mmCIF file of C-alpha atoms and ligand atoms in Angstrom:
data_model
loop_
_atom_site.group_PDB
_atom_site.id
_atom_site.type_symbol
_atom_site.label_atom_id
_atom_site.label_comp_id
_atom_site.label_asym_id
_atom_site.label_seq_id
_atom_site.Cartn_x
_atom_site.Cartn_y
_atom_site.Cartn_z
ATOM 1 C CA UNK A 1 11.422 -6.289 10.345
ATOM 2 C CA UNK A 2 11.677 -3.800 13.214
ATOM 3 C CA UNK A 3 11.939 -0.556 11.699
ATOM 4 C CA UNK A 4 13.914 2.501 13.264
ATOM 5 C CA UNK A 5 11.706 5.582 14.346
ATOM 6 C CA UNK A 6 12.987 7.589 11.384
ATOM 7 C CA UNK A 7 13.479 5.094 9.434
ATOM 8 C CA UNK A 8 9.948 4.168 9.422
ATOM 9 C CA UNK A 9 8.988 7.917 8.994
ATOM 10 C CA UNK A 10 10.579 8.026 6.212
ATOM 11 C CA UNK A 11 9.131 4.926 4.870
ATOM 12 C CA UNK A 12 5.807 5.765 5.903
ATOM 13 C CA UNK A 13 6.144 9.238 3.800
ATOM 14 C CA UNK A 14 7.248 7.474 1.010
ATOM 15 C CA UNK A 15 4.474 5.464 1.155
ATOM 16 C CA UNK A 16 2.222 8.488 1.283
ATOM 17 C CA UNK A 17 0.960 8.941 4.837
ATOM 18 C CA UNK A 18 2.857 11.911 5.600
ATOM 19 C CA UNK A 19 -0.437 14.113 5.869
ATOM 20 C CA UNK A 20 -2.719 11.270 4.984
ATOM 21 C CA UNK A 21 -6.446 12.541 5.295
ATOM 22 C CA UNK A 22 -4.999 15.356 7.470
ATOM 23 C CA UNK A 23 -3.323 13.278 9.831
ATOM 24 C CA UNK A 24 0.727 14.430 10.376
ATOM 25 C CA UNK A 25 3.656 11.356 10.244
ATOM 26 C CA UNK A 26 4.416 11.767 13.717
ATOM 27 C CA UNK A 27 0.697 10.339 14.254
ATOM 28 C CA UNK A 28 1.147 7.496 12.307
ATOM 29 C CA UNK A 29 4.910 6.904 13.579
ATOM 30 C CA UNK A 30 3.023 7.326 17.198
ATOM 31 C CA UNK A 31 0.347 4.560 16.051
ATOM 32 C CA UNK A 32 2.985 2.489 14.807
ATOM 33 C CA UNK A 33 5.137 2.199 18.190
ATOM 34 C CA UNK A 34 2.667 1.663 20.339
ATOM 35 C CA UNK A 35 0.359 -0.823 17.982
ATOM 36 C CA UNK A 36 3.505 -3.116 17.193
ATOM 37 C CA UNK A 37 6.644 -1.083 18.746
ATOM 38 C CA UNK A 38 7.430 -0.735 15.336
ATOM 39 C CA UNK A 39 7.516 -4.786 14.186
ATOM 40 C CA UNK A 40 6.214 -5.818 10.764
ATOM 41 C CA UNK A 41 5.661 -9.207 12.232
ATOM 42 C CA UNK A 42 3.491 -8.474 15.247
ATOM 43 C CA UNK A 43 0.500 -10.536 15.736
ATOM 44 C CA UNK A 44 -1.723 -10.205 18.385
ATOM 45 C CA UNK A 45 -5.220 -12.022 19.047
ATOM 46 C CA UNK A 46 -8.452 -10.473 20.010
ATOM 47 C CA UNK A 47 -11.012 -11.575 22.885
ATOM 48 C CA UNK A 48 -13.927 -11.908 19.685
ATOM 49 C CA UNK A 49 -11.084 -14.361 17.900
ATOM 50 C CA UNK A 50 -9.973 -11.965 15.182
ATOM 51 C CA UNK A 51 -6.215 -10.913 15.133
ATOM 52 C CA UNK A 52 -4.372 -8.031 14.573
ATOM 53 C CA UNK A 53 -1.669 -7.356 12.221
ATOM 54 C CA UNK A 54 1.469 -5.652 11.653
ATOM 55 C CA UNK A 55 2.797 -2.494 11.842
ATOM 56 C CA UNK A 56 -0.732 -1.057 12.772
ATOM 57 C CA UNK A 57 -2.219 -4.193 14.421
ATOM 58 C CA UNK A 58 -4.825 -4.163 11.549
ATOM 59 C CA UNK A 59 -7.776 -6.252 12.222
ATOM 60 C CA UNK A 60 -9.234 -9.778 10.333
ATOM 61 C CA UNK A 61 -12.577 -9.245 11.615
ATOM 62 C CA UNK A 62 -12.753 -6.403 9.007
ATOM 63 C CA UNK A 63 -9.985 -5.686 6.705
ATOM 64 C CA UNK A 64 -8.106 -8.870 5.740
ATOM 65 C CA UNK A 65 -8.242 -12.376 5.329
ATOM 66 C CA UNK A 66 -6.831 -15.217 7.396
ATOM 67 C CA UNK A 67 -9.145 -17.956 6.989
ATOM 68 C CA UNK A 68 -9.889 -18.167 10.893
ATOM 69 C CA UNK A 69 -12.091 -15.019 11.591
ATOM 70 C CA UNK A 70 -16.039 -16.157 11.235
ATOM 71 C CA UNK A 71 -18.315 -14.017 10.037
ATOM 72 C CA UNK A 72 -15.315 -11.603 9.014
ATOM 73 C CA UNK A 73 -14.563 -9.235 6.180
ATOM 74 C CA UNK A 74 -11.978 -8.824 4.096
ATOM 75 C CA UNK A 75 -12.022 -4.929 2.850
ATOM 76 C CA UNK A 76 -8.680 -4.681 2.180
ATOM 77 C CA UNK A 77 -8.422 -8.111 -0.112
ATOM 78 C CA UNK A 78 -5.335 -9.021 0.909
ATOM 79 C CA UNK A 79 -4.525 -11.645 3.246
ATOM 80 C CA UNK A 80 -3.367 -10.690 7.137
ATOM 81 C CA UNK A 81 0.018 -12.756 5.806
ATOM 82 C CA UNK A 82 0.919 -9.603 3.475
ATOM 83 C CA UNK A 83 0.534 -7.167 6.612
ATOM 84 C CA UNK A 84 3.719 -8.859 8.184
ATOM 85 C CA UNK A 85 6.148 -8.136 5.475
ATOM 86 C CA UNK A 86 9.226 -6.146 5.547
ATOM 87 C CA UNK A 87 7.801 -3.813 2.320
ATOM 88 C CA UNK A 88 4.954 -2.075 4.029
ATOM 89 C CA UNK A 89 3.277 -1.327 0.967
ATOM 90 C CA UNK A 90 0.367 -3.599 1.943
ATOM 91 C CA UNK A 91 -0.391 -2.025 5.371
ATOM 92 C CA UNK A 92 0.179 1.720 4.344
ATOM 93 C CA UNK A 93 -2.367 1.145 1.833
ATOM 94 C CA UNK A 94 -4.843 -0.740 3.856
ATOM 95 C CA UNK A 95 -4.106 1.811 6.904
ATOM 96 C CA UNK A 96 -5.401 4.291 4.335
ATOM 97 C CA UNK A 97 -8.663 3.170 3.286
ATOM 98 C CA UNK A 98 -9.467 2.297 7.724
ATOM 99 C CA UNK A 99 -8.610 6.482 8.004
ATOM 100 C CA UNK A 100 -11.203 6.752 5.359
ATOM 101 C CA UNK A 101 -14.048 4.853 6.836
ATOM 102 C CA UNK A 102 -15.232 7.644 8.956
ATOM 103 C CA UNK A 103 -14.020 8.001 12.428
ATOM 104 C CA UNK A 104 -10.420 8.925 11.315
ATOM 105 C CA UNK A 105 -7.673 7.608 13.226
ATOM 106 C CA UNK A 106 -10.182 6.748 16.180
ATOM 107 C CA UNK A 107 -10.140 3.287 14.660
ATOM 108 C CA UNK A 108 -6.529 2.589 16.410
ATOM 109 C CA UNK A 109 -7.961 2.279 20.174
ATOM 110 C CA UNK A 110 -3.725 2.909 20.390
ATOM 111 C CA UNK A 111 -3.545 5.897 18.864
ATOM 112 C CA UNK A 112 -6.866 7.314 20.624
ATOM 113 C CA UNK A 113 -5.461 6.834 24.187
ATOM 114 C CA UNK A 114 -1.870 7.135 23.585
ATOM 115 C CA UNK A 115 -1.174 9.756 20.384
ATOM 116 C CA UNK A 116 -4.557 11.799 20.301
ATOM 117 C CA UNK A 117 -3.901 15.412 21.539
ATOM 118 C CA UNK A 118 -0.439 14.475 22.664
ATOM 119 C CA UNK A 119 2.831 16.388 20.889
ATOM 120 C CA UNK A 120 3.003 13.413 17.897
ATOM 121 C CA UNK A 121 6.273 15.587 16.044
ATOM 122 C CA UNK A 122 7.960 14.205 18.616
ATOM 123 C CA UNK A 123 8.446 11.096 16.913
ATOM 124 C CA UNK A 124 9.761 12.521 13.753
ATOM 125 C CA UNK A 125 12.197 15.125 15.553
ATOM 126 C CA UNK A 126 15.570 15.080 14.335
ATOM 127 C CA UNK A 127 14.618 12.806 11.412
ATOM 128 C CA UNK A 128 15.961 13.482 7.931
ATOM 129 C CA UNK A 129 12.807 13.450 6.177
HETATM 130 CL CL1 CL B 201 9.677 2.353 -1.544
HETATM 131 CL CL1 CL B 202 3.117 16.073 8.458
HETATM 132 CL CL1 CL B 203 6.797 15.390 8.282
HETATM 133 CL CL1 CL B 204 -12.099 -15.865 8.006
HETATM 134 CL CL1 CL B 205 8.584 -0.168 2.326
HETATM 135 CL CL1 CL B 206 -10.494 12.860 10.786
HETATM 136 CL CL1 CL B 207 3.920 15.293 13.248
HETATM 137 CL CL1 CL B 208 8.488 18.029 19.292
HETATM 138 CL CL1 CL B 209 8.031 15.821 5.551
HETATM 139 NA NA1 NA B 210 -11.336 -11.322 7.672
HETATM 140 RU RU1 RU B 211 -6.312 -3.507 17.467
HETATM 141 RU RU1 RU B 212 -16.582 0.214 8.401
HETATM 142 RU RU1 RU B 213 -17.020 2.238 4.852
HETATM 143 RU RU1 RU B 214 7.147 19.876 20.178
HETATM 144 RU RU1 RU B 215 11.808 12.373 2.186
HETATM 145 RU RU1 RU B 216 10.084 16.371 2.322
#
């Protein structure tokens, strides 16, 4: 699915992120468009063989399973399959335990050099949240 801006604000609030360990929607909307440009079914491989997932390009060397990634983790449990789906109940949650793990949102390389310090309510304005 390729979600509308707002539409995946409002998805993504739903879902719980809207202030998510102190990070505003417009940061995660920001994340989202420039890790996938908003696709649930972007894949993208990595130059240590993992792959990325999703609507936040989530990673199989750490947080899911795909059956391809050696040595990998799976912190998540879920498999990278269920981070491509139009609900994106299984990303939003898995996006939440990466902001946990200690360096915040730092752990989208995307959202470091393209969001970070940047005016992120931009990508909610005008929504009807
Ligand atoms: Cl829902
Ligand atoms: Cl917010
Ligand atoms: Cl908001
Ligand atoms: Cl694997
Ligand atoms: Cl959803
Ligand atoms: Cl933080
Ligand atoms: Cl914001
Ligand atoms: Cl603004
Ligand atoms: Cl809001
Ligand atoms: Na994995
Ligand atoms: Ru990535
Ligand atoms: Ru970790
Ligand atoms: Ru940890
Ligand atoms: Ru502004
Ligand atoms: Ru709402
Ligand atoms: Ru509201």
């Amino acid at each position: 699915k390729v979600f509308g801006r707002c539409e995946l604000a409002a998805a993504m609030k739903r879902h719980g992120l809207d202030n998510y360990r102190g990070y505003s929607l417009g940061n995660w909307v920001c994340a989202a468009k420039f890790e996938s440009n908003f696709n649930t079914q972007a894949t993208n491989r990595n130059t240590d063989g993992s792959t990325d997932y999703g609507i936040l390009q989530i990673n199989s060397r750490w947080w899911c399973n795909d059956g391809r990634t050696p040595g990998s983790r799976n912190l998540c449990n879920i498999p990278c399959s269920a981070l491509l789906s139009s609900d994106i109940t299984a990303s939003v949650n898995c996006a939440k335990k990466i902001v946990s793990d200690g360096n915040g949102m730092n752990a989208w390389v995307a959202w470091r050099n393209r969001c970070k310090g940047t005016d992120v309510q931009a990508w909610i304005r005008g929504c009807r949240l």
